[PDB]
Amino acid sequence: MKVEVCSFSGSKVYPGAGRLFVRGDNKVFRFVNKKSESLFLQRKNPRRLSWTVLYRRMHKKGI
Amino acid sequence: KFEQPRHGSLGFLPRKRASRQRGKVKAFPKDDASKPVHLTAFLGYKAGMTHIVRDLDRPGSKMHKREILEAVTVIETPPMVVVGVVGYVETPRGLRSLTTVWAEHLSEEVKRRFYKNWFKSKKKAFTKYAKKYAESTQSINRELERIKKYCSVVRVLAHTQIRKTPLAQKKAHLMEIQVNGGSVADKVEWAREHFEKTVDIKSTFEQNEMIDVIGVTRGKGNEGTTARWGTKRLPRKTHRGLRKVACIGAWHPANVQWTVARAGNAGYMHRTQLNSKIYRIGAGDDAKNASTDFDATEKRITPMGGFVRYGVVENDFVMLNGATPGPVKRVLTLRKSLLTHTSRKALEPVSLKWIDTASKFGHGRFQTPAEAKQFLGTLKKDVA
Amino acid sequence: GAASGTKYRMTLGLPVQAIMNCADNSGAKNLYIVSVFGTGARLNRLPAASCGDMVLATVKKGKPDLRKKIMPAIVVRQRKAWRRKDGVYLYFEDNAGVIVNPKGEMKGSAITGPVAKECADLWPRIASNAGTVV
RNA sequence: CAGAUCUUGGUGGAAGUAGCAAAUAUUCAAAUGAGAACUUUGAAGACUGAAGUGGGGAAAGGUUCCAUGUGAACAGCAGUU
RNA sequence: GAAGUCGGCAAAAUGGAUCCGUAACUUCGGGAUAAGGAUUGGCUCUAAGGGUUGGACAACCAACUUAGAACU
RNA sequence: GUAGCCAAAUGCCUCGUCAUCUAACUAGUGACGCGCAUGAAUGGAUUAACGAGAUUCCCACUGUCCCUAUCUACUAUCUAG
RNA sequence: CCAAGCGUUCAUAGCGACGUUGCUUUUUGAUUCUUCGAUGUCGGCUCUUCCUAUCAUACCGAAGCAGAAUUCGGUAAGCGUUGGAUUGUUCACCCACUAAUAGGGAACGUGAGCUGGGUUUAGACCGUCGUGAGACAGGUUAGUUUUACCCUACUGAUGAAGUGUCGUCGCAAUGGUAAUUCAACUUAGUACGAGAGGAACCGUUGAUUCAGAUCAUUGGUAUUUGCGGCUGCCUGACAAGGCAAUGCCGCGGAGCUAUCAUCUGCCGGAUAACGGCUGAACGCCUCUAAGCCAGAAUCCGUGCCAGAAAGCGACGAUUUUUUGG
RNA sequence: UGUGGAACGGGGUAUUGUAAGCAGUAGAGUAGCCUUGUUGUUACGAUCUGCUGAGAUUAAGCCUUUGUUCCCAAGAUUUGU
Ligand SMILES: [Mg+2]
Ligand SMILES: [Mg+2]
Ligand SMILES: [Mg+2]
Ligand SMILES: [Mg+2]
Ligand SMILES: [Mg+2]
Ligand SMILES: [Mg+2]
Ligand SMILES: [Mg+2]
Ligand SMILES: [Mg+2]
Ligand SMILES: [Mg+2]
Ligand SMILES: [Mg+2]
Ligand SMILES: [Mg+2]
Ligand SMILES: [Mg+2]
Ligand SMILES: [Mg+2]
Ligand SMILES: [Mg+2]
Ligand SMILES: [Mg+2]
Ligand SMILES: [Mg+2]
Ligand SMILES: [Mg+2]
Ligand SMILES: [Mg+2]
Ligand SMILES: [Mg+2]
């Protein structure tokens, strides 16, 4: 019972959450919800959206 | 020409609103006198749905020893109180209730069942009967003796402790629960001894048991034949609407046949669904209600934020696999199975690996308050 | 039928008249689904395929020799998300298949792009030529 | 006279039924009054948006114009208008 | 993705402007916006294109375009 | 019955025959022609451009369909008149 | 029915002439009994039900090692009987899938159900015909598809009480009823077979079609006008807003919803075909003569839905010191 | 008159995606004035950064609440072995 991490938001992915997308270049993406999946397909950079953890890690939010 | 099966089942007719809400046991399991005395049914309340992960033990299956995800239904089942007994005599016109014996004291919630306005009433429901019980205690024993001599079928009168749930309704639900087991005298003796006593869910059912669930389905109001019966949508060009049946009958019989789909009531109907498997009988007194041998986190069976439109489940519960009739908080009748089960699917012991307790009020990502606090760190409100 | 065993129900994504990429090097590019094997009887319902399903197809773009004829093919990728028994909903970027003979042996020799696990378990010839599976 | 899809007049069941749903939209307070969703005043919210729901004419009408009153009939709900 | 249907009926899609590019055929006029591509905000600048007017020149006033650059 | 033209909006037989397109076409197009009953200002043939004309197909597109679901306004509905 | 015969050999495994007895016809025809003060007209779509003359599914019988293939052969209509290219079509042929793609009836089922491709004779073109107006075993193109608000039926929705009242818990007459089919693997390279090859009952894991729910997950939906973004104009600017008949775009809880999602869908009795037992007549033989077994997806029940609003029971309290009981 | 109710408020749960305001030379640059500077003051400048996982919304068919403030001990009809 392993818990994945969203490829866009970085949040914990418990079983049954979101969808898995496997791209043509064999790269597998796990999305926690439709918002993360939709944003990813809108070519959005997760590092530019403040609420994600990639933005928080890069910008050292919360020290 | 171009055959197709008829739409819907003629076995579920008429599709009128059920004449009841509770959920009626139409047939109790066949009585075996060789077994000990036991109950055959229980009343619960639909709290909500979640999902689990468990390891499948099914040899020959591609998912054998692999993890599967399953939706489950949580039914809140606080102990019921036995308040009476009814004896039935076998007659050539069917079973007939010979007499009914009640406990000396009945709680307020069950006495509310005998009133439309309990508050405005004088609360005179069993007051003269109660005095009889404490005058000589001899008409009670005589009535019980008559059930022993006659009355091949014995059923206890049991009611729910609805005040222990978060429901706004204070009037308890009361039902006859057939007593199956050894000997009519032992049924009556068992029943008398349980007057004003609680019977809890684990004394009725057990882990991995296959049961039936009886309830009244979600109300839908009226529906046209397209959704009520599943008929094909008529073309876009159809003058005067397309959510109907094109031809509702031939010439001769010069009458609309009862087998033709018609618009009408589409919900609130009585259904008994068979073969629900008990995945867990939770205990309301232990703080690891939703913990497993693989998920040691101390958590109970209430999602974050509470069950939507229900609240917190603080009592005993059952975790049936799959779906059940009716909406959240409708009272549901759980019945012992009438069938015998020997299939591998029915007989496989069920051991849960993980129970989801994330919020069902949205795309919730934290199982517990502690997990949320750790992932996010601190917030503006948390510091001060 | 007689692939390696059985396949769970999967959300169908490719009805008849759907056109999917050819994922192999057989010379074809444009599989056009004509029928789906195992399809029973249901008025007005289109036969539809999922990953791992054998279909009948024609080639619309590619080598002139491959065209104008019905051949078997196996779906290996699909865009419609389906549900695995472990609760995961997954999908690919495109719809693709490979030309096979009735026994399930690949007409081509290489497969470009990922291949669904359901297709790989059922058809070992596809699994042999598959690169990354799922 | 029982008849003529008879003539003229009167009156039924269908029935308190079909319906009175195009043109964005009304609200608050006051006055008057037996009575105010519909009158008048103030306030708000809106619309026509200059090829106007604005300002005039030709044709046609003929007093419909104005003031003061009235409120049976008419204004397919109402009426102090 | 037309499998629907007699039939793409209805709907969808296209759409302004600027710069590229534009087949058969032709009565040589057309076809043609054929087809088929790219671009388009905001801000801060640069260049060029005209008039009144003081002793090769000129301090204002009165002006409107077009093209381009950087930043975002 | 010449030049032309054609199973043509003119061919009964007829779903003519061959070829092409399609997985598959009594469609369509191209050919063929003893043409029931084509044919020369009763105008024959061809034709760029134009056409809310008829017909076949391809791309785009899409709830036409697989297979239905959801939402808004006005009705229907209940009330007063 | 008849039996000359084919069927190396055996007239009726399977074929079977000449005759002869019947059924049906959805064929135009025949007739002219109903309708001309008017019964809307093909096909398709949709939807239900019925018949059996059985394509498939269940069980049985006969021919030859199995394996099969035929007689679907006998019962049997419970349950299925498809996606397309075409035909306006009916019919039909074609590509496929499928366990299988059986045939019919219901005013040639079905137009106040649609659609209007057919028919559709008003406009128009052609061929043949006609001196002409015009015509047609023809071809072509364009051509308004009205009304339920009545009775009944059907679908759902309330409901008076003389048999006390109002409740609670029940019974059950009667009506309805539901599941279906497939694949792979074990059996098993086994029974069987010179060899090649090659099963079956059962079991398991899945799947099709149907049925009843449900909304944890996933997907769709957006007046959550919830949050954010955008253009034009308007409130002097900022901020905050408004208008643009829901202005437009992203995400969007809740709800609703998806074979786009998930859950669940038995066993008892009597039989048919047909096969056995005890047993005769017709002193033997033989399933029948009486009887007893066995026996199908058949039928009837249990189970599931309704619950007689004029079928019924058990139980609770009985207008309160006014007045009624 | 009750472990009563309601209206608010608080906590939780969700959705969005970082509010207004103030500050910073962060900012393509540009123009005026000076002691003339690897922080030159000055003014304009889409935007950027920080306070700020902020702010807003959160039952309308979410959960919870010992918080606050109010409310109710009422009328009418019928029914008897
Ligand atoms: Mg119409
Ligand atoms: Mg939820
Ligand atoms: Mg169809
Ligand atoms: Mg008279
Ligand atoms: Mg007379
Ligand atoms: Mg008359
Ligand atoms: Mg009305
Ligand atoms: Mg306007
Ligand atoms: Mg305006
Ligand atoms: Mg004027
Ligand atoms: Mg496409
Ligand atoms: Mg078609
Ligand atoms: Mg079709
Ligand atoms: Mg159109
Ligand atoms: Mg031709
Ligand atoms: Mg001449
Ligand atoms: Mg109506
Ligand atoms: Mg019955
Ligand atoms: Mg305005």
mmCIF file of N, CA and C in Angstrom, chain B residues 203-268:
data_model
loop_
_atom_site.group_PDB
_atom_site.id
_atom_site.type_symbol
_atom_site.label_atom_id
_atom_site.label_comp_id
_atom_site.label_asym_id
_atom_site.label_seq_id
_atom_site.Cartn_x
_atom_site.Cartn_y
_atom_site.Cartn_z
ATOM 1 N N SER B 203 -23.279 -9.546 18.392
ATOM 2 C CA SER B 203 -24.017 -10.731 18.804
ATOM 3 C C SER B 203 -24.997 -11.217 17.747
ATOM 4 N N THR B 204 -25.270 -10.416 16.722
ATOM 5 C CA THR B 204 -26.142 -10.811 15.625
ATOM 6 C C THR B 204 -25.366 -11.303 14.411
ATOM 7 N N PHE B 205 -24.374 -10.546 13.962
ATOM 8 C CA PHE B 205 -23.608 -10.852 12.765
ATOM 9 C C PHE B 205 -22.129 -10.963 13.109
ATOM 10 N N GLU B 206 -21.339 -11.446 12.153
ATOM 11 C CA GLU B 206 -19.910 -11.642 12.365
ATOM 12 C C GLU B 206 -19.120 -11.216 11.132
ATOM 13 N N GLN B 207 -17.806 -11.086 11.313
ATOM 14 C CA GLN B 207 -16.911 -10.727 10.221
ATOM 15 C C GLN B 207 -16.996 -11.758 9.103
ATOM 16 N N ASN B 208 -16.998 -11.274 7.860
ATOM 17 C CA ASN B 208 -17.071 -12.052 6.622
ATOM 18 C C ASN B 208 -18.441 -12.650 6.344
ATOM 19 N N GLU B 209 -19.436 -12.394 7.183
ATOM 20 C CA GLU B 209 -20.762 -12.939 6.943
ATOM 21 C C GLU B 209 -21.418 -12.283 5.734
ATOM 22 N N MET B 210 -22.181 -13.073 4.997
ATOM 23 C CA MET B 210 -22.940 -12.595 3.854
ATOM 24 C C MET B 210 -24.365 -12.339 4.327
ATOM 25 N N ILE B 211 -24.833 -11.106 4.190
ATOM 26 C CA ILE B 211 -26.152 -10.716 4.650
ATOM 27 C C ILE B 211 -26.902 -10.040 3.512
ATOM 28 N N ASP B 212 -28.155 -9.720 3.781
ATOM 29 C CA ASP B 212 -28.992 -8.959 2.876
ATOM 30 C C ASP B 212 -29.342 -7.619 3.505
ATOM 31 N N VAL B 213 -29.471 -6.603 2.660
ATOM 32 C CA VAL B 213 -29.833 -5.265 3.099
ATOM 33 C C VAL B 213 -31.157 -4.892 2.460
ATOM 34 N N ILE B 214 -32.075 -4.403 3.279
ATOM 35 C CA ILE B 214 -33.418 -4.030 2.872
ATOM 36 C C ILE B 214 -33.618 -2.570 3.232
ATOM 37 N N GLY B 215 -34.033 -1.774 2.261
ATOM 38 C CA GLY B 215 -34.346 -0.381 2.514
ATOM 39 C C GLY B 215 -35.196 0.181 1.399
ATOM 40 N N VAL B 216 -35.663 1.402 1.610
ATOM 41 C CA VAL B 216 -36.407 2.147 0.606
ATOM 42 C C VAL B 216 -35.437 3.063 -0.127
ATOM 43 N N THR B 217 -35.492 3.038 -1.453
ATOM 44 C CA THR B 217 -34.509 3.708 -2.293
ATOM 45 C C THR B 217 -34.695 5.226 -2.272
ATOM 46 N N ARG B 218 -33.706 5.915 -2.836
ATOM 47 C CA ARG B 218 -33.751 7.365 -2.940
ATOM 48 C C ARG B 218 -34.981 7.816 -3.721
ATOM 49 N N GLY B 219 -35.676 8.815 -3.187
ATOM 50 C CA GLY B 219 -36.759 9.432 -3.926
ATOM 51 C C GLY B 219 -36.249 10.145 -5.168
ATOM 52 N N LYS B 220 -36.992 10.000 -6.263
ATOM 53 C CA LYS B 220 -36.647 10.640 -7.523
ATOM 54 C C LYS B 220 -37.737 11.539 -8.090
ATOM 55 N N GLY B 221 -38.935 11.542 -7.518
ATOM 56 C CA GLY B 221 -40.035 12.218 -8.162
ATOM 57 C C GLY B 221 -40.460 11.493 -9.432
ATOM 58 N N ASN B 222 -41.191 12.214 -10.274
ATOM 59 C CA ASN B 222 -41.594 11.675 -11.566
ATOM 60 C C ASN B 222 -40.432 11.651 -12.549
ATOM 61 N N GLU B 223 -40.502 10.715 -13.481
ATOM 62 C CA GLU B 223 -39.540 10.646 -14.560
ATOM 63 C C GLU B 223 -40.226 10.130 -15.814
ATOM 64 N N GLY B 224 -39.812 10.654 -16.965
ATOM 65 C CA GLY B 224 -40.293 10.148 -18.231
ATOM 66 C C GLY B 224 -39.663 8.812 -18.568
ATOM 67 N N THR B 225 -40.193 8.174 -19.614
ATOM 68 C CA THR B 225 -39.791 6.801 -19.907
ATOM 69 C C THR B 225 -38.303 6.683 -20.210
ATOM 70 N N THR B 226 -37.667 7.763 -20.666
ATOM 71 C CA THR B 226 -36.252 7.700 -21.010
ATOM 72 C C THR B 226 -35.406 7.348 -19.795
ATOM 73 N N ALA B 227 -35.668 7.988 -18.664
ATOM 74 C CA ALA B 227 -34.905 7.699 -17.460
ATOM 75 C C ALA B 227 -35.581 6.681 -16.549
ATOM 76 N N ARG B 228 -36.908 6.619 -16.545
ATOM 77 C CA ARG B 228 -37.605 5.675 -15.676
ATOM 78 C C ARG B 228 -37.423 4.243 -16.152
ATOM 79 N N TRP B 229 -37.437 4.032 -17.463
ATOM 80 C CA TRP B 229 -37.388 2.703 -18.041
ATOM 81 C C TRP B 229 -36.203 2.488 -18.970
ATOM 82 N N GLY B 230 -35.435 3.527 -19.281
ATOM 83 C CA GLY B 230 -34.299 3.371 -20.164
ATOM 84 C C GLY B 230 -34.625 3.291 -21.637
ATOM 85 N N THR B 231 -35.754 3.843 -22.067
ATOM 86 C CA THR B 231 -36.095 3.795 -23.480
ATOM 87 C C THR B 231 -35.175 4.712 -24.290
ATOM 88 N N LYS B 232 -35.063 4.401 -25.575
ATOM 89 C CA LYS B 232 -34.212 5.155 -26.486
ATOM 90 C C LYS B 232 -34.726 6.577 -26.685
ATOM 91 N N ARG B 233 -33.811 7.544 -26.692
ATOM 92 C CA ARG B 233 -34.168 8.908 -27.060
ATOM 93 C C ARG B 233 -34.643 8.951 -28.508
ATOM 94 N N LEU B 234 -35.793 9.565 -28.722
ATOM 95 C CA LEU B 234 -36.306 9.758 -30.062
ATOM 96 C C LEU B 234 -35.483 10.830 -30.785
ATOM 97 N N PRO B 235 -35.548 10.876 -32.114
ATOM 98 C CA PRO B 235 -34.653 11.764 -32.871
ATOM 99 C C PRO B 235 -34.847 13.234 -32.524
ATOM 100 N N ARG B 236 -33.832 14.029 -32.853
ATOM 101 C CA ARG B 236 -33.888 15.472 -32.633
ATOM 102 C C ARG B 236 -35.072 16.123 -33.353
ATOM 103 N N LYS B 237 -35.453 15.609 -34.522
ATOM 104 C CA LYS B 237 -36.518 16.187 -35.337
ATOM 105 C C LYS B 237 -37.926 15.985 -34.760
ATOM 106 N N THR B 238 -38.091 15.166 -33.724
ATOM 107 C CA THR B 238 -39.418 14.762 -33.266
ATOM 108 C C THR B 238 -40.233 15.951 -32.766
ATOM 109 N N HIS B 239 -41.313 16.257 -33.470
ATOM 110 C CA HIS B 239 -42.292 17.222 -32.991
ATOM 111 C C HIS B 239 -42.968 16.699 -31.723
ATOM 112 N N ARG B 240 -43.157 17.594 -30.746
ATOM 113 C CA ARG B 240 -43.852 17.317 -29.481
ATOM 114 C C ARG B 240 -43.020 16.463 -28.524
ATOM 115 N N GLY B 241 -41.705 16.518 -28.640
ATOM 116 C CA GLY B 241 -40.840 15.976 -27.616
ATOM 117 C C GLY B 241 -40.271 14.615 -27.980
ATOM 118 N N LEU B 242 -39.138 14.298 -27.370
ATOM 119 C CA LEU B 242 -38.440 13.075 -27.696
ATOM 120 C C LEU B 242 -38.170 12.157 -26.509
ATOM 121 N N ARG B 243 -38.422 12.585 -25.273
ATOM 122 C CA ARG B 243 -38.201 11.734 -24.099
ATOM 123 C C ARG B 243 -39.459 10.915 -23.793
ATOM 124 N N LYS B 244 -39.816 10.042 -24.729
ATOM 125 C CA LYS B 244 -41.032 9.247 -24.604
ATOM 126 C C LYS B 244 -40.876 7.946 -25.387
ATOM 127 N N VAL B 245 -41.951 7.166 -25.408
ATOM 128 C CA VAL B 245 -42.074 5.971 -26.231
ATOM 129 C C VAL B 245 -42.891 6.333 -27.463
ATOM 130 N N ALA B 246 -42.406 5.953 -28.642
ATOM 131 C CA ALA B 246 -43.089 6.359 -29.866
ATOM 132 C C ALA B 246 -44.460 5.698 -29.986
ATOM 133 N N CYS B 247 -44.533 4.381 -29.826
ATOM 134 C CA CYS B 247 -45.783 3.644 -29.990
ATOM 135 C C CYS B 247 -46.103 2.911 -28.696
ATOM 136 N N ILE B 248 -47.183 3.318 -28.024
ATOM 137 C CA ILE B 248 -47.534 2.708 -26.748
ATOM 138 C C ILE B 248 -48.532 1.573 -26.907
ATOM 139 N N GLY B 249 -48.839 1.175 -28.134
ATOM 140 C CA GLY B 249 -49.624 -0.016 -28.361
ATOM 141 C C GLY B 249 -50.209 -0.145 -29.750
ATOM 142 N N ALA B 250 -50.661 -1.345 -30.070
ATOM 143 C CA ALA B 250 -51.266 -1.664 -31.348
ATOM 144 C C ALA B 250 -52.746 -1.315 -31.310
ATOM 145 N N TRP B 251 -53.386 -1.413 -32.465
ATOM 146 C CA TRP B 251 -54.821 -1.641 -32.494
ATOM 147 C C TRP B 251 -55.092 -3.051 -31.972
ATOM 148 N N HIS B 252 -56.093 -3.205 -31.111
ATOM 149 C CA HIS B 252 -56.460 -4.565 -30.697
ATOM 150 C C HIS B 252 -55.309 -5.330 -30.047
ATOM 151 N N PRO B 253 -55.138 -5.243 -28.718
ATOM 152 C CA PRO B 253 -56.150 -4.822 -27.745
ATOM 153 C C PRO B 253 -56.301 -3.328 -27.732
ATOM 154 N N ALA B 254 -57.546 -2.857 -27.758
ATOM 155 C CA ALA B 254 -57.844 -1.437 -27.847
ATOM 156 C C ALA B 254 -57.699 -0.818 -26.462
ATOM 157 N N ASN B 255 -56.523 -0.991 -25.879
ATOM 158 C CA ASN B 255 -56.210 -0.602 -24.520
ATOM 159 C C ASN B 255 -54.697 -0.532 -24.415
ATOM 160 N N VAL B 256 -54.217 0.355 -23.560
ATOM 161 C CA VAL B 256 -52.787 0.420 -23.295
ATOM 162 C C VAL B 256 -52.405 -0.741 -22.386
ATOM 163 N N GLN B 257 -51.407 -1.504 -22.792
ATOM 164 C CA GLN B 257 -50.993 -2.664 -22.026
ATOM 165 C C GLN B 257 -50.126 -2.264 -20.838
ATOM 166 N N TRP B 258 -50.244 -3.051 -19.768
ATOM 167 C CA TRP B 258 -49.502 -2.852 -18.530
ATOM 168 C C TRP B 258 -47.997 -3.023 -18.708
ATOM 169 N N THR B 259 -47.549 -3.585 -19.821
ATOM 170 C CA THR B 259 -46.129 -3.813 -20.039
ATOM 171 C C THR B 259 -45.444 -2.669 -20.778
ATOM 172 N N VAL B 260 -46.156 -1.597 -21.091
ATOM 173 C CA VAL B 260 -45.605 -0.481 -21.857
ATOM 174 C C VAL B 260 -45.043 0.556 -20.890
ATOM 175 N N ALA B 261 -43.862 1.089 -21.200
ATOM 176 C CA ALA B 261 -43.235 2.092 -20.346
ATOM 177 C C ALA B 261 -44.054 3.382 -20.335
ATOM 178 N N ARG B 262 -44.259 3.936 -19.148
ATOM 179 C CA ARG B 262 -45.016 5.165 -18.976
ATOM 180 C C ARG B 262 -44.291 6.068 -17.986
ATOM 181 N N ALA B 263 -44.440 7.377 -18.165
ATOM 182 C CA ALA B 263 -43.883 8.320 -17.202
ATOM 183 C C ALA B 263 -44.585 8.161 -15.861
ATOM 184 N N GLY B 264 -43.819 8.293 -14.786
ATOM 185 C CA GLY B 264 -44.376 8.157 -13.456
ATOM 186 C C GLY B 264 -43.288 8.206 -12.405
ATOM 187 N N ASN B 265 -43.657 7.812 -11.188
ATOM 188 C CA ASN B 265 -42.722 7.790 -10.067
ATOM 189 C C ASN B 265 -41.531 6.879 -10.353
ATOM 190 N N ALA B 266 -40.325 7.384 -10.097
ATOM 191 C CA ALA B 266 -39.092 6.673 -10.431
ATOM 192 C C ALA B 266 -38.210 6.364 -9.226
ATOM 193 N N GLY B 267 -38.669 6.617 -8.011
ATOM 194 C CA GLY B 267 -37.828 6.340 -6.865
ATOM 195 C C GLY B 267 -38.602 5.960 -5.623
ATOM 196 N N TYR B 268 -37.945 5.987 -4.467
ATOM 197 C CA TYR B 268 -38.580 5.690 -3.180
ATOM 198 C C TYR B 268 -39.293 4.337 -3.204
#
